[PDB]
């Protein structure tokens, strides 16, 4: 029998009403894990590249990590995939929360949409029972708000409800799905789930979930929060609060936000305020946030409690994590009050908290410049934070300017046009990336933001630190218990690595080295979103509980499947290039492969090619970004060589 | 892990030449246990009742049982199944020797065909690898002889091949598939292979096959081996040679057909021969058969060797075994030496032994009586012997009054009509049944003429005599060590038997008695053709090793699931009434259960009526045959009691 999965999952038509279960194959599982790796195996059989994003036959799916459900800290994560309406790539997205456990706990890995219905409506699934409700009384309502009448219908108080506001209804490219104090939110993926006519899906779980090896996989749970004590009694040295720890960014713990107020571009990524961080608005700003915050909570089974409920006076409560606590507040030059009571609105109608304040930012230079004119804009308030909240809701709603400005900064300023392309200065492959405008070329960076699948920085860094310590003692002394890293060689390039001098960047690490470490950091995330691991306990902060080193005993423990280090090395690499494949197959080459050209001040052309070009040798690709027909056969993945011949995409010899 | 089975069927759509492997569902498993019982959820919810059998939605499968490929002696058996184009309704055909257990050895538990091939195609498979291959140059080349040049073809002397002959090409109602000494025999599986323009299916299987609990297993193989050692020393007292130890009938090695002869009708199941054997007789087809008889051989796991090469001068060695060996000799009025000579040519041809004898036994009865002119039969040998050669060529061509008689016998005289109806007097639902006009009503054959969804009752007899003992002596003794029985009442029964006196049929047993018997022996047969057990160590002789109490142990440590008596006995009426519900809703009813007008001279019809009301309400059924709401429900089979019910098959209530 199947261990940690549960072996089945959700065939559901939009258009015809119908609804399956279908058992899973098990030789998927010892290929591509789960999660992400075999969403990525179903899109790339399922969903040729003619299909469009919002065309019937695109997929849409609910993915539950293969370890979900299960005893082990932090693993509760949602991979919903699909094709991403404003990239025209494949669109991956994580939520947190407690929605996947509860699908694992209903008896499904996954739920698969295809189709559209003509009618709003919602999925209702009660362990064996699944059925399709209308939702035409929902239809405006926001994300939040959906889901407590929803359970209040049915009378499911303890049901997990995924929705999307009104900006997926109307299909913003940049359109989420929430739920609690969770969110889907880069890709679009909310904006496809609307065009599916798709409110929201209701899951009600409470059946068992069994693991292989009992005794053995309770002995590596209990090791994870040993060491999750330990780790948070000795917070890495020297480096800034949000940094330190485990788990996401805690940004709704910590009140300093110094080094990502003068170090980040407010605007539309275009500011740098070197000297914001006063004494006046480090007070400010803690007493508003002292103010808002009401508690502290966790995901499913996590005691790092990330994120917090905020309050803000006059309206209603919603949840927040991370960053997308500053991105409002930074790109309309005001403060934390209105970032905070923005946010509401934004997450309510199911907007990226990361494109959206970079879209209005965007859209009010064009306005300044003079490419956009008054007339565009009727009825446009006074203040600079009214202007913002007038601009929310045309975009939400595809009012008149609002309706170009929904599709992104690369799209919309391709349809403005009179220059309005130089100010979309901040994309890759037509996604809009962290404010970040630095000064010298750091070239572990560059290649994260080249390759990175998801095209989010944040989501692919974390195992290697970001800045070298001034003392050679001080990296003694982290490379001392540094028991996460793979090889060897990882210390010691940590060793050498120094801030100034004949061993700093942009030329140190060496191009061999920093490939290696990219390599590294992206396959760390891999796992995370194919397990469903949170990447707050694993990818994401220094010296996590989880590493390369005891994963494949929880995924043998869990899913009684053989697994080791290599084996599990090879896993995540497999399925990598899979995604790879995919987007190669929708039109993806080298060329689309570039950061900003503003991103740095100091840019080395040749040193930056060699960069590349070395990576594709190491991930085993053409130096044009494709997986040769030698690495594919290699990984078990010989029908997607031959596809690629019989395209073209590669040449016979 | 799954055990047992190997968990994937390949989905082939002939039509389109698509070829796909699939993960089946073990839930299937468990309430189907396999082979024929998962065929039948297969048909049943993907071959609707507005299916034609030659329809290209109408489906082929090729099912292993659920313990071939495993060291269960005997277990082999292939499990074939369509919707037969000679009765309209269900049919399922078994094939022993060595293909089932070479596909479980490949990695699959089914094949399943859709579609029609627009040129004649055969199936290769070896583990991995399947692909189509051309077949136009075996164009009406025979069964075995396709084979050889196959394996040649492809260099692969230890492929298995199950091919069709020119009869299966030609859509004849009876054509056969033929696997070198086994063969898919009746119903008209044939037909549908080759409507689909499919030549053969050839595989080579050089995969491990895993059991769940090792030891166990082979303990009870052991078990088998020592208990057929002991019941070929005891073959059982007063019993004829041929039904007196296991295996199929053993024709091929007792000479002596005294039995047969004088019990049997000769010709069209018209003329009985009272004084037939003789000394003059015996020597003669003693003479023939040691000539022709080249060795005894047996099927894949199992000592027995029922079957045996036949060579007869000027002709190419074909495979035999039971009763074939008999119906052309019989329906010719002829000897064995014409027999076998015309079973070579038959055989190669791919057709069914039971009906071509009787099929050109009436054709011949039509010409004598003068519905049939001498013009219908253009170039007719004068010699009987001669003729039969001729009309068996006219019904493989489909050639003038071939094209009729391929039709069998039922809508032959449909056809020709002008009185022909009456000389179809041995048919049960359109189909031909065994040469066999006896005297006085038997009550425990009449309830299985009636209701043996095979409809051939060679094929659902076996666990109970077939007559009483003389003394009481030899009734005690022989239920001593009868443990193979389901209770102790069935002891009793055989006791209180007896050939005459109040004790005798029709009156003895008792109605209740006879239910019992029936429904005893008809669950052996279902359980043999869901493991893929033979019979002729199982549900055909007399105290076999396989029986219903160490079944559930064999199931248990065979495949790794729960398994008991109860359970199993529960697991057989669950699949054998879904069968009965794919026949009912196809048209079946209470009327088309009957057997022939004249099948007894002695009748009571009462006493019929009395036995299949009570036979329906053991099996839950209604007083028309169909299967109650209730029983549905009980059997897990409720999606069916809906669909009846929609349908307006069963009253809502
Ligand atoms: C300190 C760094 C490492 C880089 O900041 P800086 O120190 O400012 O580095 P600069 O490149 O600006 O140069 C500084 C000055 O020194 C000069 N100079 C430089 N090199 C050299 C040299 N070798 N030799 C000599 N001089 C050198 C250079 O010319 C310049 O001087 P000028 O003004 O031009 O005259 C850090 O702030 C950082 O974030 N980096 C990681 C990358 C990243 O973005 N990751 C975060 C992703 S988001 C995330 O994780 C997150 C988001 C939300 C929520 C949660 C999480
Ligand atoms: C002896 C039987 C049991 C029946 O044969 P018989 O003895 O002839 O039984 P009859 O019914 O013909 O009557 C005889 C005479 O006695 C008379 N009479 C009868 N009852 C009574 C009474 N109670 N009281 C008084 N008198 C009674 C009756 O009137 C008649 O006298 P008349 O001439 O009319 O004046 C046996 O031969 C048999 O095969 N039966 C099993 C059923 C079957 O067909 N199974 C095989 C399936 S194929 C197979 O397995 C296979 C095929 C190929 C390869 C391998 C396998
Ligand atoms: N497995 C996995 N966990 C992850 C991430 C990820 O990309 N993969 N993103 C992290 C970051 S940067 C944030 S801001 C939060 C957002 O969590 P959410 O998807 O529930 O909104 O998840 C964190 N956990
Ligand atoms: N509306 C909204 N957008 C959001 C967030 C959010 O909490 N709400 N979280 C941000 C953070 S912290 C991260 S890490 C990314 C997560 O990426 P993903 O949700 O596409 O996987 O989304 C960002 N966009
Ligand atoms: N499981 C099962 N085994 C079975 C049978 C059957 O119907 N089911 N038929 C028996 C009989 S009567 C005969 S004559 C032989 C025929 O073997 P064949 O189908 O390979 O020609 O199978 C024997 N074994
Ligand atoms: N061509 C051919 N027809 C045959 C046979 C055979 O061996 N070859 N077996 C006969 C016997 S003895 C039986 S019991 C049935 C078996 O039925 P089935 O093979 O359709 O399951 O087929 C009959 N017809
Ligand atoms: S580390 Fe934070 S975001 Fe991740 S599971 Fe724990 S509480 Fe949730
Ligand atoms: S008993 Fe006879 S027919 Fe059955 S498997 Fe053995 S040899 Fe073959
Ligand atoms: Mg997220
Ligand atoms: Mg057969
Ligand atoms: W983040
Ligand atoms: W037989």
């Known amino acids: 029998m199947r261990y940690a999965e549960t072996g089945y999952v959700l065939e559901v038509d939009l258009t015809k009403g119908s609804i399956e279960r279908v058992a899973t194959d098990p030789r998927d599982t010892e290929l591509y894990l789960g999660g992400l790796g075999t969403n990525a195996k179903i899109l790339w059989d399922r969903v040729p590249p003619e299909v469009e994003p919002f ?204 080094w990502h107020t003068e170090n980040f571009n407010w605007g539309n990524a275009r500011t740098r305020r070197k000297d914001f961080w006063t004494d006046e608005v480090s007070h400010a700003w803690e007493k508003t946030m002292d103010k808002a915050r009401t508690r502290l909570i966790s995901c499913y089974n996590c005691p790092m409690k990330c994120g917090a409920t905020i309050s803000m006076e006059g309206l209603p409560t919603y949840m927040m994590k991370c960053f997308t606590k500053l991105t409002y507040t930074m790109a309309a030059y005001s403060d934390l009050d209105f970032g905070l009571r923005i946010a509401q609105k934004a997450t309510e109608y199911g907007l990226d908290g990361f494109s959206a304040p970079q879209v209005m930012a965007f859209a009010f230079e064009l306005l300044e410049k003079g490419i956009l004119k008054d007339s565009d804009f009727p009825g446009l308030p006074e203040g600079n934070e009214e202007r913002f909240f007038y601009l929310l809701d045309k975009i939400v709603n595809r009012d008149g300017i609002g309706d170009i400005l929904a599709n992104g900064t690369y799209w919309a300023a391709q349809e403005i046009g009179n220059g309005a392309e130089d100010y979309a200065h901040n994309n890759i492959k037509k996604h809009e990336q962290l404010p970040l405008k ?80 990219v390599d590294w950091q992206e396959m760390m995330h891999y796992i995370d979103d194919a397990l469903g691991q949170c990447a707050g306990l694993s990818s994401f902060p220094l010296k996590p509980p989880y590493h390369i080193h005891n994963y494949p005993k929880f995924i043998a423990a869990g899913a009684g499947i053989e697994m080791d280090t290599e084996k599990l090395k090879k896993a995540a690499k497999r399925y990598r290039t899979l995604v790879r494949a995919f987007n190669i197959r929708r039109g993806m080459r080298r060329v689309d492969e570039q950061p900003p050209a503003n991103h740095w001040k100091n840019r080395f052309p040749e040193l930056e090619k060699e960069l590349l070009d070395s990576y594709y040798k190491l991930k085993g690709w053409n130096d044009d970004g494709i997986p040769t027909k030698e690495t594919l056969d290699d990984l078990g993945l010989g029908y997607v060589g031959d596809e690629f011949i019989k395209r073209g995409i590669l040449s016979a010899g």
Chains 1, 2 share one sequence.
């Not at 025209?88 to 994580?94: G, I, Q, V």
């Not at 708000?145 to 049915?154: G, P, R, S, V």
């Not at 080249?450 to 003694?476: D, H, M, S, V, W």
């Open 55 to 258: 065309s019937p036959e695109n997929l849409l799916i609910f993915a539950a990590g293969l370890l979900c459900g299960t005893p082990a800290t932090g693993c509760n994560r949602t991979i919903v995939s699909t094709v991403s309406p404003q990239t025209k790539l494949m669109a991956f997205s994580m939520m947190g929360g407690f929605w996947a456990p509860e699908l694992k706990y209903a008896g499904y890995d996954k739920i698969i949409f295809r189709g559209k219905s003509p009618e709003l409506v919602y999925l209702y699934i009660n362990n064996d029972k699944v059925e399709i409700r209308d939702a035409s009384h929902l239809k405006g309502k926001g994300a939040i708000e959906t889901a407590e009448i929803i359970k209040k219908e049915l009378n499911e108080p303890r049901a997990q409800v995924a929705a999307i506001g009104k900006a997926g209804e109307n299909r913003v490219f940049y359109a989420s799905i929430e739920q609690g104090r969770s969110s889907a939110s880069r890709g679009g993926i909310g904006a496809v789930m609307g065009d599916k006519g798709l409110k929201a899906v209701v899951v009600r779980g409470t059946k068992d979930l069994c693991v292989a090896k009992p005794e053995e996989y309770i002995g590596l749970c209990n090791e994870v929060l040993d060491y999750i004590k330990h780790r948070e009694e000795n917070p890495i040295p020297d480096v800034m609060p949000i940094l330190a720890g485990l788990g996401s960014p805690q940004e709704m713990k910590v009140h300093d936000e110094k």
């Open 438 to 517: 630095l000064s010298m070329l750091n070239p572990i960076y560059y290649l994260m933001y080249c390759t990175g699948e998801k095209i989010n920085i944040t989501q692919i860094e974390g195992q290697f630190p970001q800045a070298p310590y001034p003392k050679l003692e001080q990296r003694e002394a982290f490379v001392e218990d540094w028991i996460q890293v793979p090889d060897e060689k990882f210390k010691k390039i940590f060793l050498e690595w120094e801030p100034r001098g004949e061993k700093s960047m942009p030329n140190f690490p060496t191009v061999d080295m920093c490939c290696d470490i």
